[PDB]
Amino acid sequence: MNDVFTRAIAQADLKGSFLLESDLDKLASFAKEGVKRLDAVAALTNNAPAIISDAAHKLFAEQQELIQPGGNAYPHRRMAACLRDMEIILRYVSYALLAGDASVLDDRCLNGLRETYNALGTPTQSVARAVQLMKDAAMVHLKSTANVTVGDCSSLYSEAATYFDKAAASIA
Amino acid sequence: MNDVFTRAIAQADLKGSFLLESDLDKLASFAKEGVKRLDAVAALTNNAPAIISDAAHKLFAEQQELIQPGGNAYPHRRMAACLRDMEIILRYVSYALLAGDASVLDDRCLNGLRETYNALGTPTQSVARAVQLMKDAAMVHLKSTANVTVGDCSSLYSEAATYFDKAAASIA
Amino acid sequence: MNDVFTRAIAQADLKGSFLLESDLDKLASFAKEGVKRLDAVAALTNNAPAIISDAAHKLFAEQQELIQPGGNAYPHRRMAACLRDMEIILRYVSYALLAGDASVLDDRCLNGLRETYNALGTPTQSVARAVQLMKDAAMVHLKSTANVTVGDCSSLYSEAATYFDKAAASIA
Amino acid sequence: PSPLEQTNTYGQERVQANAVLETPQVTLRAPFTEEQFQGALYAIYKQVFGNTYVMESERPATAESQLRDGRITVRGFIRLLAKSDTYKARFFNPATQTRFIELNHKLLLGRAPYDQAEISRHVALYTSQGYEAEIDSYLDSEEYQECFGEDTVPFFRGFTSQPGQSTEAFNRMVTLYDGYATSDSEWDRGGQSARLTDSLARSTMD
Amino acid sequence: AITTQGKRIYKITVSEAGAYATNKHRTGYRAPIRQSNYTLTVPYDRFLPEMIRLHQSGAKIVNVTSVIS
Amino acid sequence: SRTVITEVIATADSQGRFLNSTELQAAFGRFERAVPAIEAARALTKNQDALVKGAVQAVFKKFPYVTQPGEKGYGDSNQAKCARDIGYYLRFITYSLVASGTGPLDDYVIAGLREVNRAFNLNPLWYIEALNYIKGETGKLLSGQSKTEALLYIDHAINALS
Amino acid sequence: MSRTVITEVIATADSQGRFLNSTELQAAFGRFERAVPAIEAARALTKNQDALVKGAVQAVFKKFPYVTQPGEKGYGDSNQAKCARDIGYYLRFITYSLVASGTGPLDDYVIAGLREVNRAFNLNPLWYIEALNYIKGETGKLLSGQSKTEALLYIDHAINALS
Amino acid sequence: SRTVITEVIATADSQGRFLNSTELQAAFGRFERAVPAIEAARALTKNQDALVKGAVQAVFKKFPYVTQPGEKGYGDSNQAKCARDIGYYLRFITYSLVASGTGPLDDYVIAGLREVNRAFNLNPLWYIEALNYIKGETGKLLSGQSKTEALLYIDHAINALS
Amino acid sequence: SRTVITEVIATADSQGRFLNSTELQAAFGRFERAVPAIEAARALTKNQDALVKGAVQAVFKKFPYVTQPGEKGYGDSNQAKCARDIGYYLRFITYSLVASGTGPLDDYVIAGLREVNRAFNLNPLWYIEALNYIKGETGKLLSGQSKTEALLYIDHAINALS
Numbered sequence A, B, C: 001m002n003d004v005f006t007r008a009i010a011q012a013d014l015k016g017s018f019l020l021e022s023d024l025d026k027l028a029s030f031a032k033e034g035v036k037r038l039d040a041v042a043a044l045t046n047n048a049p050a051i052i053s054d055a056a057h058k059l060f061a062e063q064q065e066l067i068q069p070g071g072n073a074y075p076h077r078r079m080a081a082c083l084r085d086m087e088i089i090l091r092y093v094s095y096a097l098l099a100g101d102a103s104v105l106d107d108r109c110l111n112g113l114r115e116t117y118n119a120l121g122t123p124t125q126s127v128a129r130a131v132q133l134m135k136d137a138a139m140v141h142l143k144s145t146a147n148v149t150v151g152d153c154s155s156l157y158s159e160a161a162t163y164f165d166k167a168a169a170s171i172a
Numbered sequence D: 001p002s003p004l005e006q007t008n009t010y011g012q013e014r015v016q017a018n019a020v021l022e023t024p025q026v027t028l029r030a031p032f033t034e035e036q037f038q039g040a041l042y043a044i045y046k047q048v049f050g051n052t053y054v055m056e057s058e059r060p061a062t063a064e065s066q067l068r069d070g071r072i073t074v075r076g077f078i079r080l081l082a083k084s085d086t087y088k089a090r091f092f093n094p095a096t097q098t099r100f101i102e103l104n105h106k107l108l109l110g111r112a113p114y115d116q117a118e119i120s121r122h123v124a125l126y127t128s129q130g131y132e133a134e135i136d137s138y139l140d141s142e143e144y145q146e147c148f149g150e151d152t153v154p155f156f157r158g159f160t161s162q163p164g165q166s167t168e169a170f171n172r173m174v175t176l177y178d179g180y181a182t183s184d185s186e187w188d189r190g191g192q193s194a195r196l197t198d199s200l201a202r203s204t205m206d
Numbered sequence E: 001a002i003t004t005q006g007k008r009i010y011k012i013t014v015s016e017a018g019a020y021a022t023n024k025h026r027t028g029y030r031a032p033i034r035q036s037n038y039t040l041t042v043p044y045d046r047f048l049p050e051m052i053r054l055h056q057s058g059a060k061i062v063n064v065t066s067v068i069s
Numbered sequence F, H, I: 001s002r003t004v005i006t007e008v009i010a011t012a013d014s015q016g017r018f019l020n021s022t023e024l025q026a027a028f029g030r031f032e033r034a035v036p037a038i039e040a041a042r043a044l045t046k047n048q049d050a051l052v053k054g055a056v057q058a059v060f061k062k063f064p065y066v067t068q069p070g071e072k073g074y075g076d077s078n079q080a081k082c083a084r085d086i087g088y089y090l091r092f093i094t095y096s097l098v099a100s101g102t103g104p105l106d107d108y109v110i111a112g113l114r115e116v117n118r119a120f121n122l123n124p125l126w127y128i129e130a131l132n133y134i135k136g137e138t139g140k141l142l143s144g145q146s147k148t149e150a151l152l153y154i155d156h157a158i159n160a161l162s
Numbered sequence G: 001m002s003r004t005v006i007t008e009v010i011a012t013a014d015s016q017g018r019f020l021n022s023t024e025l026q027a028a029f030g031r032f033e034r035a036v037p038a039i040e041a042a043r044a045l046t047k048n049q050d051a052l053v054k055g056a057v058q059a060v061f062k063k064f065p066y067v068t069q070p071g072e073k074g075y076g077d078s079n080q081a082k083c084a085r086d087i088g089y090y091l092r093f094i095t096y097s098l099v100a101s102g103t104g105p106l107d108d109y110v111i112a113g114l115r116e117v118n119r120a121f122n123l124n125p126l127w128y129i130e131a132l133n134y135i136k137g138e139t140g141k142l143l144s145g146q147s148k149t150e151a152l153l154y155i156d157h158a159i160n161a162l163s
């Protein structure tokens, strides 16, 4: 389970050379962006109830067969599992965001989810669509400037979007 | 774990509709005759040591390749496993009878026992023959009406016979 | 586990007969040579750390592409794992020698290690030269009669040879 | 450098389970705060029930409150949790007793069983003294205690050589883990069939 | 357990005598060193195995009191 | 789900022992208690739409501000969802009555209730009010054995809500 | 999976994550030195198994003759054949454990599950107790010295398992 | 691997919450100290070769008796190996600086050093005086908080070797 | 309660080992963040009364249907207890700022919050909105860092309320 720094260390060790000065500069730039990254992670943490709820209402507006009798999340426990998997996906993406790279998900969170949802009979595309709706809600919250030092987190918005979309692809 | 009544509720929720009138009338008829099934399983349980003793006695009467060295039940441990195997088979079928459903029997005994015996080298037809001796002794002790009021229990005998039938089919 | 005497008794049960006089003859021969067996196993135990050390020396001199970076022994935790591996495999083959029956080797040592190493990325061929260097180092101490009465153990010597041959063909 | 690259944890991620070798055990020793009360509880819950989600209404408030006071060790709370009906409903209820014992090994010792002789002995114990006796055997087994302790949360010690452990346990729990996502409910049909029995069959003979 | 015998839990007060400490040191401190004196709650059902395992651990019982009667 | 026979089976299986007199007595008791429970099931079956509409309008009486725009009760589709939820509750109560226990009810609503309540801000007091109205009106629809047992199912669900 | 001296030695040494110390090597030597009298006992008991089994049959008949009465489970030609086969199995396994110099063969082969056999088949151990008592009475002259007490130990272990 | 961000991320994952003030505050501290530590590691890379070769010579000036023909220290490939190993030690120290966590040392060299030394009879004290040499130079070649943290990491490296 | 150094010492005693870098850096983090939290505590010390009052009026305002007679909002003792509650919460918030951690706030209000919330009909969202008001004035009273961590602590209080 690697961050940008730890991974960089890993491949630098793989070539068996010292860290390259340019790599040092990239890590320094990451250090510069660290405060923005912490703002982003804190914002993601703060708006967790609102984001999970809003994603739920979009999902349920656009799909109803999930809640139909026998629908893949029909009972209260099963609907709760439906929502809590999407929130745990948010959990792990936030984890990667603070960690600064997308290794942690493919390491542990989405290591074997495909076969799990096939075995559960879960339609993958539904989980994917939930992921993009989570993405929409998340970007909506992150573009907010509430009580934050103004700047340019466009890199962070794009990179969290990469998290979301690659996780959604891995769901498939 | 599911019984025929529980499976009826299951289909009721699968269509999402309330319990019907005809099927609930059938359930009431089952409830009034539940005493019959209770008496049948009571006869099974009281005569269970006798039933297993007689079935095993005729089992070793017909088959002799087991008591000989290299037989599937030669050492005390192996035929002990055999004996408790028939014991467990009859016990789980009695559970199925109380449920009226083989789903408990399937979930307990038949989820993975056949490949278990394949790995062990145990032949299945021997176990099926043991099951049929089980049914012979069981119907002998149950179709007797000693110390109990007499009545029509052909449905109960048929249900127990069919449950041993599906058990034998699953194992072999 | 199943020692040589245990294997004799097991095959006797498989044929369901008493021991032959010739059986007791081989078993008495094994019992009388057990003293030389104990001398051999003591030779193993006394030099075991030394043996694993110099065997590793010949291995890594023979194969330099591993201690260097990018090798599955580089990060020096893999030093610990590798050394423990030689230690434990020599320990189990010592167990096999003492018992005189390679069964315990097969069970406790090499039931499924091939998949273990392949799923770990370890090239087992290296392990095969590892164990043959192990025998090369050990046989010197075995021939060492320092502080022990001299004698012929060509039977024991060949037995250990075939033991490590089993280990080689196994892990290969 | 080598023609082929081998990173530090490379074995950890090529095997389906990496973080378990990195994620530590948890202990609850001295009076402490609600935050990691619930943290340790969630860890234990994901641990013991094979990555099945432990639904909130299922938990006994009295047992966790008593553990909060500490009249019991964590081991006693594990025992009481094993006595919970929902535990049997998840594992004892839909699965065969051999598959039951394999799952119980995985979830109470973190490792697959060593040999089919262990399987036979443990089934014999279950047959002789009912359900809870086998669980009490695991939680009273000495290697569990000395390896974990009265106050340590059980974890997956698989993918890690245990003192005098069979070479088969690694392979079996590799086949049995298959990631975080693998739940052992009555669904997914994997917690019902005894995946290990075929491998265990080879152990008795040679 | 539910039986009249199964109830009547008995409190057990345990001291890590020198024998237990010597045993634990040589077996290895795979668990944190906890203080010598500690009370433990043990029902009738598992009453025997408690001081059995403590005796194989080398520890000795301080005293035992009965919760019920 | 969990019906008296199912706990009997599972418990007997636990200790690895056959059935005994006590569990057969419990099964017997279930068998005679089923008939009043079946009658209660019929009574709640033929009154379903009135049950739903009365509960929704009682919620209106105690919680009319909920129907105000910008809140949950506002919206025709929202109210269709309210009625559908209450109908699901009553159907599971019927399953509970026919089950001689709370097995299916627990399994299909009580497993995961407060979680969704927090999720969509679904106040359990709303459903407490709805089931209190159902209790009051079943005070008229039913009588005697069926009334009392259906009341115990409904107020068990209520206490689970609380 | 039979328990013997060397096998339990290997298991214990594997258990502690250690090699074989002085104690296990000395125990192995003791096993080698004690095997030869066990070998003599096994061979001598192998020679004269016919007389032992027939005398055991008549002795168990003499102890409780009522089992041989008609209408009892002991009466019958098949019953006699089974008695002879069973006692032959006992002496087979006792010689086996003498050879292994450990009760483990007997343990696994008979002592595993014997009790449920006796309860499910009403075969009270008393008849097999008498059989083993006759075996010890006859072997009190068949063997000598160490082999005598060696055989006595394992047959009495079988008795204690039966009792 | 192991580094303050990674312990935080694990103890928030395996514990199952969202992060609060303490851990993000630690992240603030790490992301701010990066520049001192990172330029320090840059300097270490900038002066590494003198460090390693003078470390070899320092060992010999303290351990000449290990060098004579007929004992372990004698040997040309032996020498190349000596420089190689101390090179990795310096290297992993640099990685530790970059990660701002004692992790890389733990994962690679502190993981299982003791028994491989016992296998090869490698006296850790050798590496200890090599690192003492290293700290003697870094006292001058580096300044302020950077020399502080570098000294701290190499001290913990000795404590491992100790 | 616990401060950051409390987890520091608890962990270090848990492994029974001496403190390495990371927890000492946490000690820093706390020390340099102390001052901003210090003026945050200063401000909250000066402003408390109006904060409590405005919380009372705001919760009466955006929840109008609780104010009228016949429910929780009506009854003088009710809003007296509201005022004492808000005073206690923001005092624990000051404690959180001083401790630079959730310790006092958590172990004083957060423990057992939900079961009390439905054990006395006290709607939590009442308290979420009270703390939202408190955010309302603190968005003007404080500035910079003090504002930032005060915001975070009141956010965590809300999050545990939510």
Ligand SMILES: CCC1=C(C)/C(=C/C2=NC(=C\c3[nH]c(/C=C4/NC(=O)[C@H](C)[C@H]4CC)c(C)c3CCC(=O)O)/C(CCC(=O)O)=C2C)NC1=O
Binding pocket: B057, B060, B061, B067, B068, B069, B073, B074, B075, B076, G060, G067, G073, G074, G078, G079, G080, G082, G083, G084, G086, G089, G090, G109, G110, G117, G121, G123, G124, G127, G128, G131
């Ligand atoms: C592990 C090797 C092995 C042993 C040890 C063995 C003993 C043995 N003999 C049996 C039958 C029997 N054995 C006897 C002999 C009895 N008659 C009396 O005098 C005495 C109590 C005793 C002999 C002294 C009899 C009469 C039966 C018939 C029981 C029946 O089938 O009803 C059975 C029950 C299985 C069956 O009835 O077919 C066993 C286990 N069989 C084996 O394969």
Ligand SMILES: CCC1=C(C)/C(=C/C2=NC(=C\c3[nH]c(/C=C4\NC(=O)[C@H](C)[C@H]4CC)c(C)c3CCC(=O)O)/C(CCC(=O)O)=C2C)NC1=O
Binding pocket: A032, A033, A035, A036, A038, A039, A040, A042, A043, A142, A143, A144, A145, A146, A148, A149, A150, A151, A152, A153, A154, H021, H024, I145, I148, I149, I152
């Ligand atoms: C209690 C924990 C804590 C947090 C979270 C925190 C945030 C924080 N973010 C900062 C800078 C910043 N913060 C942001 C992020 C914002 N700007 C835009 O991008 C977005 C609207 C928004 C993203 C959420 C940016 C972009 C900077 C300046 C850095 C840069 O532009 O590269 C600063 C420095 C203020 C300055 O010197 O001007 C702080 C203190 N401080 C803390 O003590």
Ligand SMILES: CCC1=C(C)/C(=C/C2=NC(=C\c3[nH]c(/C=C4\NC(=O)[C@H](C)[C@H]4CC)c(C)c3CCC(=O)O)/C(CCC(=O)O)=C2C)NC1=O
Binding pocket: B032, B033, B035, B036, B038, B039, B040, B042, B043, B142, B143, B144, B145, B146, B148, B149, B150, B151, B152, B153, B156, F021, F022, F024, F025, F028
């Ligand atoms: C605690 C367990 C339990 C037992 C043992 C029990 C015996 C029992 N079975 C009954 C019903 C009965 N059960 C049977 C079935 C029996 N008769 C048939 O011939 C078969 C041989 C056999 C079943 C295989 C019959 C015929 C009745 C009476 C008819 C009826 O159900 O009304 C009744 C009610 C008789 C009455 O109300 O007048 C009793 C007391 N009841 C129990 O609650």
Ligand SMILES: CCC1=C(C)/C(=C/C2=NC(=C\c3[nH]c(/C=C4\NC(=O)[C@H](C)[C@H]4CC)c(C)c3CCC(=O)O)/C(CCC(=O)O)=C2C)NC1=O
Binding pocket: C035, C036, C037, C038, C039, C040, C042, C043, C142, C143, C144, C145, C148, C149, C150, C151, C152, C153, C156, G022, G025, G026, G029, G030
């Ligand atoms: C603690 C367990 C134990 C051990 C270790 C043991 C060793 C041992 N080996 C002996 C004889 C012997 N030992 C050996 C074996 C050695 N000579 C061969 O050259 C080989 C190089 C080597 C074996 C690999 C031989 C050949 C004899 C002579 C006995 C004979 O004539 O067969 C003796 C009797 C005389 C003496 O004291 O040396 C002992 C005690 N005895 C024990 O009770």
Ligand SMILES: CCC1=C(C)/C(=C/C2=NC(=C\c3[nH]c(/C=C4\NC(=O)[C@H](C)[C@H]4CC)c(C)c3CCC(=O)O)/C(CCC(=O)O)=C2C)NC1=O
Binding pocket: C072, C073, C078, C079, C081, C082, C083, C085, C086, C088, C089, C108, C109, C113, C116, C120, C122, C123, C126, C127, C130, D009, D010, D011, D012, D159, D160, D161, D162, D165, D166, D167, D170
């Ligand atoms: C029961 C006895 C037993 C055996 C047989 C055994 C083999 C074994 N070696 C392993 C890892 C390993 N094994 C090795 C050694 C190999 N790699 C290099 O190529 C060397 C040349 C070569 C040594 C011959 C290494 C370096 C690892 C570390 C791989 C990793 O951690 O990912 C593992 C996985 C986890 C572990 O135990 O460390 C097993 C199970 N383990 C046991 O407990």
Ligand SMILES: CCC1=C(C)/C(=C/C2=NC(=C\c3[nH]c(/C=C4\NC(=O)[C@H](C)[C@H]4CC)c(C)c3CCC(=O)O)/C(CCC(=O)O)=C2C)NC1=O
Binding pocket: A066, A072, A073, A077, A078, A079, A081, A082, A083, A085, A086, A088, A109, A110, A113, A116, A120, A122, A123, A126, A127, A130, D051, D052, D053, D054, D180, D181, D182, D183, D185, D187
């Ligand atoms: C460690 C990381 C992690 C993963 C990978 C994970 C997946 C996961 N999903 C599960 C069940 C579930 N998961 C879902 C969610 C999906 N199905 C529906 O189609 C929804 C549309 C969709 C949501 C987007 C549902 C509905 C269930 C309940 C199915 C059942 O078991 O009956 C379970 C069973 C847990 C238990 O109940 O004990 C797991 C482990 N959970 C985790 O904690």
Ligand SMILES: CCC1=C(C)/C(=C/C2=NC(=C\c3[nH]c(/C=C4\NC(=O)[C@H](C)[C@H]4CC)c(C)c3CCC(=O)O)/C(CCC(=O)O)=C2C)NC1=O
Binding pocket: D062, D063, D064, D065, D066, D067, D068, D069
């Ligand atoms: C076996 C099941 C079980 C029982 C029986 C149980 C009772 C129980 N109450 C306790 C203390 C306590 N008891 C009380 C209640 C009293 N103090 C005042 O508030 C009230 C006037 C009064 C209640 C009417 C309090 C407040 C504490 C702990 C003090 C604290 O929280 O610091 C404790 C010790 C520490 C604790 O867990 O709180 C136990 C074990 N807990 C259990 O898990």
Ligand SMILES: CCC1=C(C)/C(=C/C2=NC(=C\c3[nH]c(/C=C4\NC(=O)[C@H](C)[C@H]4CC)c(C)c3CCC(=O)O)/C(CCC(=O)O)=C2C)NC1=O
Binding pocket: B066, B071, B072, B073, B077, B078, B079, B081, B082, B083, B085, B086, B088, B089, B108, B109, B110, B112, B113, B116, B120, B121, B122, B123, B126, B127, B130, D096, D097, D098, D099, D119, D120, D121, D123, D124
């Ligand atoms: C709940 C579902 C379930 C059941 C009931 C079950 C029975 C079962 N049979 C087993 C093996 C066995 N089963 C038998 C019985 C067979 N051999 C005899 O000769 C007969 C021909 C035949 C029985 C009629 C034997 C002898 C073994 C021992 C394996 C062996 O020695 O090869 C074992 C493992 C060994 C042990 O229990 O000690 C189980 C658990 N397994 C399950 O998962």
Ligand SMILES: CCC1=C(C)/C(=C/C2=NC(=C\c3[nH]c(/C=C4\NC(=O)[C@H](C)[C@H]4CC)c(C)c3CCC(=O)O)/C(CCC(=O)O)=C2C)NC1=O
Binding pocket: A060, A067, A068, A073, A074, A075, A076, A079, F059, F063, F066, F072, F073, F074, F077, F078, F079, F081, F082, F083, F085, F088, F089, F108, F109, F116, F120, F122, F126, F127, F130
């Ligand atoms: C297992 C069968 C099942 C049940 C029981 C169930 C309850 C349920 N009702 C819901 C929506 C709803 N539920 C209500 C009803 C409440 N809100 C207030 O206005 C009323 C006072 C009160 C009615 C008494 C409303 C208005 C909605 C729509 C808005 C929302 O909560 O998302 C939702 C969220 C998803 C959706 O339906 O769009 C669930 C899970 N869902 C199920 O699949």
Ligand SMILES: CCC1=C(C)/C(=C/C2=NC(=C\c3[nH]c(/C=C4\NC(=O)[C@H](C)[C@H]4CC)c(C)c3CCC(=O)O)/C(CCC(=O)O)=C2C)NC1=O
Binding pocket: F033, F143, F144, F145, F148, F149, F152
């Ligand atoms: C498991 C299902 C079940 C329930 C729920 C149950 C309650 C119950 N108790 C009864 C007898 C009764 N129960 C009570 C007790 C009540 N009345 C008093 O005023 C108190 C308010 C209260 C006691 C504190 C009384 C007074 C009677 C009638 C007289 C008698 O006890 O014989 C009756 C017979 C009346 C009828 O059938 O309508 C029922 C149904 N019985 C059951 O088999």
Ligand SMILES: CCC1=C(C)/C(=C/C2=NC(=C\c3[nH]c(/C=C4\NC(=O)[C@H](C)[C@H]4CC)c(C)c3CCC(=O)O)/C(CCC(=O)O)=C2C)NC1=O
Binding pocket: C057, C060, C061, C067, C074, C075, C076, C079, H056, H059, H072, H073, H078, H079, H081, H082, H083, H085, H086, H088, H089, H108, H109, H113, H120, H122, H126, H127, H130
């Ligand atoms: C990155 C982590 C890492 C570690 C910990 C490490 C230790 C290490 N030291 C080795 C050799 C060695 N290293 C030393 C110690 C050095 N030479 C002595 O002269 C000096 C006192 C001292 C330097 C100051 C020695 C004596 C050997 C044995 C050389 C041999 O016998 O072949 C070897 C390989 C065996 C060989 O091919 O010679 C390793 C793996 N290697 C690593 O890559």
